[model samples]
Target: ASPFRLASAGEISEVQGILRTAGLLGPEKRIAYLGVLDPARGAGSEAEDRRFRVFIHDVSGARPQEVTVSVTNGTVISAVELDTAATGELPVLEEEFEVVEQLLATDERWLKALAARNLDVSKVRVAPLSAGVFEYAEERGRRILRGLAFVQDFPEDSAWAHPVDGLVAYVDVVSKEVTRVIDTGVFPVPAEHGNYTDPELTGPLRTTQKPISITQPEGPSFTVTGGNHIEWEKWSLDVGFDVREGVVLHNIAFRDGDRLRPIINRASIAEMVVPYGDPSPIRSWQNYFDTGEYLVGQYANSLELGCDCLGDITYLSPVISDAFGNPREIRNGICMHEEDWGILAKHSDLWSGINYTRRNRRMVISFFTTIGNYDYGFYWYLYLDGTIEFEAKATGVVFTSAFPEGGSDNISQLAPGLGAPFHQHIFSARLDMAIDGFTNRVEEEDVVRQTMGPGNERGNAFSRKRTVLTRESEAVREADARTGRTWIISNPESKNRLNEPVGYKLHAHNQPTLLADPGSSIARRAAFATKDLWVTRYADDERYPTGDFVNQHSGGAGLPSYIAQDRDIDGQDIVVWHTFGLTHFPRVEDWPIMPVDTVGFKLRPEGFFDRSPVLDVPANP
Candidate 1:
């Protein structure tokens, strides 16, 4: 019997009712997130039980608490009060933004600053931003969100185009007041009406390309059973939707002959941070942990068949709870479909007198979320040839400000007066790899060449050199593209016909890591972004790479603390964390609405099969 199951709307509602009756839920106390309590790995009976991991925020007290509750018995199993002074801050609730906007509207300094710019207050909108921790008296031990001003021509106009960039309002939600206002000198607001959807604002529409449609007469090649369980071709897995981490896959396996081989125990894009490079006072504290601070999953977008997904598609509506413990459905929250890739394998031997080529297909599981100015699409792909890939598609309006033309190195001038800063979208993926079994070892393999030695007359001989990562401290490494460096997670007990351990190779795209100075606040808080790979011995509670509470964190919690024990990982249950991303230097074409910028990594089978996994595929008709 399987242990994993996606939490249902009925379960969420029942838990809320029990908590409310127990006096845990009130006007001030609320459930911020409700997710499945993952069972302990390698445990039997624990896996059979079902429970919920509920995060509650007490607005009046500003306390963050986590609890495990059993809905069947209507009892709270355990509770822990997180120390906000040390670990970090709680995620801001949805209603808090409205309160911040209301507080900003009445602030005299904020009003005076906008009035000085000769801008109508009615058309101005306040963007509620997470206040990153800085050394300031007003921000100490306070729940604060910074407000950025933007001008809008109409209700449907792009507020991002017109900027009221020089002023910032710092508001404390607990105090319900603007603690301080940082008023930098007024820079000229960009006058461009950046609405690209309207023809009146721009030019005419293009009719050059013809319509291309995707149709499958036989319908999809996948089947959904037990609500979230998916079976396609030889692959089987359970899909999960979380309030923080979206699109989680568990117990992913592939069939080989009579045996179902486990490939990955669990996988998800655990965390990501976007840190701006500009040093301006208004932009310096612009580092955001979108997954943790904003709970991007809460802002998940509903996917449409033609606009978002194509071909034969099946959508899953994930149930999520609000601050009031009310269940809300994110309709079409996840999309599952199949795509035709160019080629799986091809060969034409002149002497053999035969030609064979096979088509490649992939199962794509994806979801999209919009966080303020940016929209991100998270995709997980499984190929016909036993390849697994993850892609994060970033496409949205760029966060911009006003600066003089050709003025700063950190800022890229999209328009004459519109400046967008250089930034990095550093994403961390948590892959609980169960290659053949739970016990596995990781080795770093690098291509090396000997310099004209014994076997090399012309110095053309080269081979791969692998170093076994035996401990947590030894596994922290960076990707070396020059050497074709890759890490392998192998099960020593599982062997193929070649007498080699069955394994999978991790491939990194190897973009630059966190570009913040080591002494900066972001560098310390986002330590997980500094390395390309970190392999830690698995602990059930250690799920997030950047700790549980990431907002306004003081630093040194997640990856740093997880490795402190320095546990030996020899044939032990281990987790691999890979950091990959994109460093964006804005272009003028990226304005209005930016095209999709994708970044991700891949996991390909190294010695997992005796031969090619897709060798049995029939020739195309």
Candidate 2:
């Protein structure tokens, strides 16, 4: 159940044997390997050592147990009965996608509509869904799955950006049958997004490209020796892959002089949501919780040598379980590089006549995942200033629904019978911070204007409001540029020379919280999305922001329920969950392909760094 370490093939075969000998497997019973126990998970715990837990569930859903076995002797340590928390199955793979695509093209119900309207299913394609209401094929008493259909030439582009308004297919995942089909009766004709050679399209955006290089005249400085770990100057982290969350930085730390100070225990995306706003019969009740319904990491686009990343790019194929429950390695799944961060610092003295500038660089560890049309590029940067930055960039096609502009008051449309419906793409990150060591404190810092508080009557002055988030009950925070508010993860035991606490302040950059009605099922399903910031006491099993089990769940199980315990958070190993997203009211600019929208948070050194950490960094050596 715990995601600690990878189990070897030998260990895996032994687990199957142990289960079969004990009557856990039978003639009709099929043993599908859910996931292997990561034996190396708890480097901090010794009792859990020399063995890993194996999670296996019968396809029949009869006997589900966490089989624990000893590494050296292949002996069963324990086989504990447990309620299966996580969904055992995987998201619909490419095979499923291809099958569904053909199923739609050949179906009479689906083909008749296009034929009746003289339409072509040539560029028509179908994509998988989680059997939600949006899946048009839902039946009264049948297990169902959904796949959205859109014409590749819907806007006359090969990239099927425009979605078919009402056509949808129902699927039975187990049966592999296309049971039913439904149509909302709105056949959205394919329309070109905009002028083909318009403005920037012909000028700079269409400008010729070349293989320009970022050459380091003196060769490179950083190194990626072991494949999963990296070290550049003072930054050190063990990098790996997760099935749900892509690249995770494990035991992330910074070197301070001779000491390797711990900052993060593990950092990865907890969950993601895309909530559609149109209330039409075909539009309403369409909220996609990507991480729960689908595996975003498995859809990772392999990096190009000089394109996705630049300059001395090292590659490693990180392994994670595929949809069929196999350890599939994505070649070049993780990328690490050193980027020029401009001048770290510069100065000029008038009297002494000395002028100098020092260059800055950072170690960037990155990976990407595609959830539907949205491509989320995530990165972690270790900077020269002892600062850490986590960033997420969203670039993809807008989800289009059928509604003509000026015909409906609510629907915000971009073209005729084409509405790029307003939706919010919320990405939640779970930061389990150790902060120089184990214990960390969370303090809410808000900048407030002094209106009439004895000192200022003019209302021109502003100051910070510092409140210690002592417990989980008081930890749901919003990033308010109005209040200039931010949260600080401080270490009470560690103090700077200025008598201040050593800390890193979290600033959720350009983030927006959920706008769904609080009473709505959408809100309840993602109550964790309502708040931008949530801090909780760290638990070994509390990594996912959304409950460990989010597939098809109506409500309860994520961060909202995790913090129901109301544990004291001050000076505890704290896990900070930051939820941020883009609320898109689409426009012409997003037509064929949307320009990337970037959001990020900075872990700037508060009292953590004594001075400029990179002041002594060499120029060319």
Candidate 3:
């Protein structure tokens, strides 16, 4: 026998126990030994650069499961699941595969069809960048053009396949060339970002928040008496209110006001229901769709000048970015589900009903939401004069985490005591309003500077800020009640020191001590109470209250309602109401499906205004 004796059975079992504790092995699983190949070393390559692929047989299941793990320097490079079904499939493309080059060999029929629809096709071009792949292009004259492509199909519609159908096109002005295209038979068109070589999937980013101010320049103060007419340049506005049970009164003051006025006066606005049923013969698939009936009504009223006159309509959504840096369309303008608008209130000022309060006669509108997958909080404020201001605050939430079931038990070890005991939530907010006598014009000079992090990353989050010059001589103060910081600071390039050890001290504005006992921590509770304050005005630190936390380990739920209570502002009494629960749907159809029933609220003037002011306005021609 050699100097070292073979390990005993007990020692081997102990090693297995340690591996099981670290989640490297399952309790009921048995590992089977398999042959391993020698390290692959290229000619003249160093021994340290050698790599080895080990094949293991998992005999725990009925069929022996095969797993391949690559190792370099005894460290696992990658661990992958081996699909037994694909064992015989070749990884290389078949030699018999043929490329479709006819579509790219000077076909003008597709270009002609696009031109017949009034679409610009002058920049049209076709080329094959890869084997069995081809593309078509159309220049719309604007920054964005449309692109169509055809390529080999891959499993699960992976991005690598570049599959094509009837018509696939998207706005490529940014990273030009079919960033997004619709395969008519498949799903809707996809949006793209970056360049054709580096493509990224994109979604609309625009959102709406509460109004910063509401002004009625025309006499009579644009009242909602019988019917009212309101107008603005390139914007959509509407008024709503709850009437009674099963009947809610909604006045489509803009867009389809005329058609709804007659029915609304005699019926309930909420009762005006649209049905949801099967759109086709697919038994498992049901389409619950509703068009812009309500939205169109609002659009018409916004553009209409006289009783029946129509005005130019403009739409805006933060998600939509134009090449010239203007709002492409309104938030949820095309396919707005009630829930999406509710979510929009947190991030945008264009929508109302999030944090609407009144003091004396002035209205205070607040907007807040969490960004970056809800890792950070964004906050903003808008006065009745339309002065817009914003701040970004970081919440100590892990942006990414390992899959719990993936047998990775070192999560706690990596970021020990990192985030809150419960799941963390962040929020941001802003406000928008229509003033009584202000111009419908939006001025860039009125925009306030915004910054994120601390020292050098501050700048305008949007391409440009929309600012409103104060018409009145009253002094408008920008105050941060949480930090007692009265003046607004502009440091666009300030970088946040969040990850640094000394970052906390540099950014500390207000610090509150938390006690173990809930009842004894009145100071802690007060700091937590500032959640509403920070969400409405300034960004608070990690010490601030994080609404609710849900546990992934255990099947539990905790949803937080950010709003505390409605308040009175500037003599105007405003209430905060969300249309979340009012809108309902069953699980038979695709969820999160678009809401079949749209949800909105009513702004009852009560004794606030003199009379219906908007009634005398004429529709735009």
Candidate 4:
């Protein structure tokens, strides 16, 4: 039940070469991924232990294969082709996918072929198909590549928002041909098309201010143990790796006055789901558990010292593998440092004419994942006030679909002929609460009105009520504005001096329930998005909320399946799934580029620590 085994660069690389040598991957085969198959708890292993798996597409002439390879003493002891059949879930490889764009752009056969379709090949830009696109051509029933074309009026930046309706060009990656043209029957241009400029600048005008340099002057305050651990003041945690979801944190514990109190058993973006609002065949079918379908960690960009993070930042290199067991580095993908927050606390009394204030310093570890056009930055913070903040900063353009001028007004207006489909960017994080001890329970407290007895009637008075969840089923709840709600994960066995259980409270922020009709296909698959909170008995492999394969997948795998058992969660090790989201309707100002739309949740030590853990932090001289 811990992160133990890890494959190094050499081990991943050698095993893939061996799998190819064993003829599992043909010479002409294309790599989908080289992923480290995580070994679960208590899985006994040898001294030189390493295991890896990957998918290979047969572009030339072969059946697609999923290879499992074992490395020991620099040799592959076993290589086997595990059959995880051809599904749309496997992402289109860059090497194979970019060719489709080239064929459409430069190939005279297509550019010259475009005139008949009313598209000046030079005025159109084509991209690899997104999640919901229909698979065009298959190499012996295996998916190769398909595409969605956008009107390229001026440049790539503005054109992506405007797709020509009713017409999708299916490209055969192997042959490089526009195999079939799908007619969804809507040809449109984004009505908002114009020169891109900073949204804040009036009338799209700007001027240089002055060059200034901001520095720490003194340097960073945190300490790092090689690449394994990070510590700032008393806050610390063990770092783990996820090739797709970025880096993971394990056994994250905050330092109490006398002991290192356990908090998060494992923490990462457990699941990220963004379901488009449109019901169009091409878009309605697009409900993406982005983290599940595309490896988020594997797509992490390298971080720079001054650009990505500020203040003294310590960098760490992450080991990520491609399909076929080749290990590559996402350098400085994880950044850690101490950040200053103007004032921690300030108080003054006019009678005494004196004031007291202390500056706030926090420990921050962050990583970003660019899932297609959207970029999500996950920041984990430990403040001096004993609060662990999990924040997701979203900054990217909207995923817009081409719309006709006569299209309905339900969606937002991006431009003249473009419609920015309303959507939901909802997410759920798995918070394994090992607070002080493993066995714990949940308590729900809500703010509701106290009804009057019909005599003296002010029934408007508000009262607070609390309920303990005795079963796993009772813990499922939603965010209510009228009747405010909060859930506390606590160990009743341990009590504070106030006779309250030692625990942590999960406070919600910016929570929006799914707006799609509950009966919709996207909602059916993203069943977890229905509620804001789900408490369950902790298990080994129940991670992604949407499921294992999200691309064109129907509902079956993630939260619904895990909770179907309804095992008694009372007095058991618990994992809390808290979801937050935005009912997004893109506007014209959101075009070209987007501003950061942030959402987050907080974990505060309720009674786990007697008092402020950082109350001992001395004031600056």
Candidate 5:
């Protein structure tokens, strides 16, 4: 007898009818019946049916709980409560609705204000007006509108705010001007501005950091020497050294030819040099080192063991080759087991030192690794050439765009969230070296040669085959002649290009140094100073100098500082700048045990590298 029973059969028919009457099963429901007594045989054949399993999840709370149901009758089989409750409770979800409603109300007020100004609000669509509300606080009193919603009524027009305090201002979107001001008895209060804030009146103060000093000398200046065709261009050079017994001694003075003048000044040397000794104590002394000014650049294809705990390091084992025709073992010594390391060394070549060169406007590095005692480290190298002057760069990789399931080979599923699986991608280091800096040279007398163009022109070997540019639409205009209620023209397309000026005030630290106190130590004071510096450099602001003008991330104590700027390179205006650096807690594995890696910086030559400097050199090797 078949295990399956037809829907019209005895027991199956009865179950479906009962379920439909209870409203648990709809009229269009397709039911599958599985049981021991075969309804088709009319109580003669008794064969059990087992083909599928039924599972139901109760996700009514913060976290989902599993509930099993009977396949044949749709009855409760078993239910298990999850440890956590659901996130979207009655209150939290309601808050989202409230925010939306507040936005709508603010939009209406803005429309009315436009009409009062002899503008037509009906002609403008809500979608076109770039609308937003932020919160602000100050000593005078708490105010919200100073940080809240503001809109542009038209192209080349001023931005008007939905007055939180009695003070009102009309701001220009392009030139960033505040033309009209009205004091409604509410003074501008100074406070942090963001998405959530109470409706209060505050002062009208800018909420951005003060610009710092950045120097770029005109013309092209560099030095060239050595049989290797080594060229010491501006901010470019190459040096090689060997590591003995875990200690690396930089051959700073040694070169294939005459050594060029070192760019490291007394201040720079004091800043960049790491004191010899255990890395632990050195790392603990973070004061002398400018965490914001420094970055590590590495190159690695794959990592074994715990590479995540240490400072950034690059892995290149993926491209290396051993004598046995196998890939090298790139083990993270900081976290790998002895047995694993031994297994890896058997197939890799272990002792070849790495070589790095920067020439032809590119950076190239080559090295080998030995994973195990028996295995040899693989022999391989990486070559990266580009237009950017700075070859190496290290930026925090905390935020990333979400990807669809099975769309990428690099991501792995760890759990489920909001009805979708959560994926964590492997974080690997990217190493960029300047290749053009090497393999090219000119006579010492011709160091400041000139090429074509208005300014100083020089030969640049770092130019590459690839270039990238990004752009958005221009300002849009809309006006209504009939109602005379001119709706504010907010170009949603160009909203990102708009700038909102803000200001930040810095306070000097009056505290004494730890070294000066009897009970305090130098290390303690250094740590304090480091913390303070990090806070100042990385302070959060809405008008950061990058992609979007607004800083969506709320300002927290440890958040990094973001700088925003609009740049014009050669005739095109582009936004470019650097953000504050990042700091992470060190772990035990990162100590005495060091991982084999590389780290560096990346520079884009948009306005800077478009034309060669006046000092040009022959490309002849």
Candidate 6:
């Protein structure tokens, strides 16, 4: 059994008991995360790997603590408290959200703001935000959730379409008070209901399209060995779920010949930031770090069969710690199934020969999470050609604001008087690359055209320029679509039949990096998003891109601090961090319920295999 498997519910409960005995779990404290601990080095035995890492938040105080416990022997290893003033606050608690929402409903100042706008208090939904870093003394060193209001016609109406612009409330959870309210004049609240789900709101249904059904009469061609281990085709990996990272893939390997070749030791979407471009004081500090600040995995959606997935499905429920140090399982949080992917290969002889066609197929492991106004889907796919791909789908209603008094280019008008601010959904994926083994190297490859004279008699020639990335200082790079750039991670000692290093190539979906000015607060905190790729020597403690604490901390913590050492990375165990996402310029069609916008990257075998690995697949009849 792999040590990377998710901690069982029984183990989680046992740890809670031990922490309680150690005076770490109590009424004033909550367990932010309780999961299997990754050893500083590799693990040796099952007993040794029985250690668990627990993130404890003593909300009663200003500090957050972490503890390591050995469940096998029922003993505490170490515990420490982090200075909230230095590391920022811990991940927001589920109960804090409840408290913030409840606190706002009865606040006199909040009600006064609503009355001034001629708004009904009951019809408005107040969103509790992380209250990002700023210089205001009211927000300094305070545990707060900034409230943004949206009007709802009824209880279940989509309130995003009716934003109450220019009204912001800052609520201090520790003090249980709405500290301040900022009302910089008001704009007209959009009147549309934005209710696409209700038949009454949408009028008549379109009867032109027929229902499409997908089925696998026989069972799917995948097997779940343990509760968390999945095996399909030539691929096998362990699935792990965390309250912070959501879906994590571990020890991913391919069964080639007689040996299981390791590719990625562990991989997951580490962190994401949605930075709004609107410069309005009410909107400028709208950069939301969904993964770190709010904890996206804790809000995993329970997927439905036809709506969230198709064909035969195998669902794995993930056990996570709630605010009270109890294990809670999100049923069907992770969806696994196979998908058809057109043709893999085809060939036809001009003379007298038969046609050879192989159908392409891929196994998909996915999950969806709703972070306030928007829903995000993370889909990881493994193909027959020994390729690994990750796709993130963005959907749900756009975060709306009222049309400004004067027309502004920073906002897009979705309806008559409703507009959504332009923003970028930049996500970072952490790939702990093992390639063929533990030791690997990274290189950047660019295809360049040669001048019309030297080495090109016909004046039209191009070749690949491969540059070895030797250290952390030199590995920071960007994607150039014009030059057809790609990155390769290879094992120096491992060689193919042609005497070349066995490697996997990264195909990045290039888009604009962080658009915030270099001197801006967001640009400093989210510096990881300023580049397309970053490679560094593997350090177990280096997990997230935005550091351990991301709530309201000052900048220069995670990747920037990791690479400050500038250690040698050539032929060393390395991790690749790829920052890729969409800078959405909202269109009018994105309103109501925005259609899915997809973006991601692919890892394809460059020379990892001797030849084609899928030549043995039988043709479809």
Query: What shift in Å separates residue 276 of candidate 3 from its native position after superposition?
Result: 22
Q: Tell how far residue 205 is off in model 3, in angstroms.
A: 33
Q: How close is candidate 3 to the true structure, as a TM-score?
A: 0.19
Report the number of backbone clashes for model 5: 102
lDDT of each: 0.87, 0.69, 0.22, 0.68, 0.21, 0.87
Q: On residues 450-526, what C-alpha lDDT tens digit does candidate 2 reach at each position? A: 67656776667877778999999999887777777888898999887788888888877756788888887678778
Error of 1 at 22 (Å): 2.3
Residues 1-621, model 1: lDDT tens digits: 345767778888877887787667777886767787677755655435667888788878756777788875788888788777776777877877667668988889988998899988888888778888887766766778988888888999898888777788788887787898889889888988889898985578777978879888889999999888999879999998888998899989999888999999999888989999988898898887889888878888999988899878999999988887778899998999999898889999999988999999999999999988999999999999899999999989998888655588898887768888899999999999899988899999999978996779888888999899999879889989999999999998999999999999999997999989988989888899999999999988898898988877777879989998899886889899999999999888899889999999999999999999898988877
**Candidate 1 deviant stretches above 4 angstroms:** 44-48
Global fold similarity of model 4 (TM-score): 0.85
Model 3: lowest-lDDT 10 consecutive positions: 284-293
Which window of ten consecutive residues has the lowest lDDT sum in model 5? Answer: 336-345
Ranking by lDDT: 6, 1, 2, 4, 3, 5
Q: Rank the candidates by TM-score, best first.
A: 1, 6, 2, 4, 3, 5
Model 5 CA deviation exceeding 4 Å by range: 1-147, 155-621
| TM-scores vs. true structure, each candidate | 0.98, 0.85, 0.19, 0.85, 0.18, 0.97
**Residue-level lDDT tens digits of model 4 in 1-621:** 223333467766776677766766556766766655555443545343456656666666455565566665444444443332323345456565356666667655455445545676666766565434333224323343445666666663466655655554556565556665556554545545533553643364547656445466777777766456767677767777776456667767777766887777777777777877776655555565667666677777788877888657777777766654467888788887787777877779899998877888778888887866688888888887778888888877677776546766556666666667777788788777888767888888788676786743876666787788877667778877667678888897888788888888888973678887887766766788888988888777576677554554544557877887787777788888888876777866777677788888898788887766666767877
Name the candidate, 3 or 5, with the larger lDDT value.
3
User: Stretches of candidate 4 above 4 Å error?
Assistant: 1-8, 17-31, 35-39, 42-88, 99-117, 131-146, 153-157, 169-180, 184-205, 208-214, 348-355, 452-463
Candidate 6 — number of clashing residue pairs? 0
Give the poorly placed runs of model 2, Cα more than 4 Å off.
Answer: 1-95, 99-115, 118-123, 132-143, 152-162, 175-180, 191-211, 323-326, 403-417, 451-461, 619-621
Model 6 reaches what TM-score against the true structure?
0.97
**RMSD (CA, Å), each prediction:** 1.4, 4.6, 29.9, 4.4, 31.0, 1.5
- Cα error of candidate 5 at position 506, Å: 26
> Residue-wise lDDT of candidate 6 within 440-492, one digit each (tens)?
99999999888888678898788899999999999899889999899999999
lDDT of 1 at 61: 70
Which has the better lDDT: candidate 1, or candidate 4?
Answer: 1
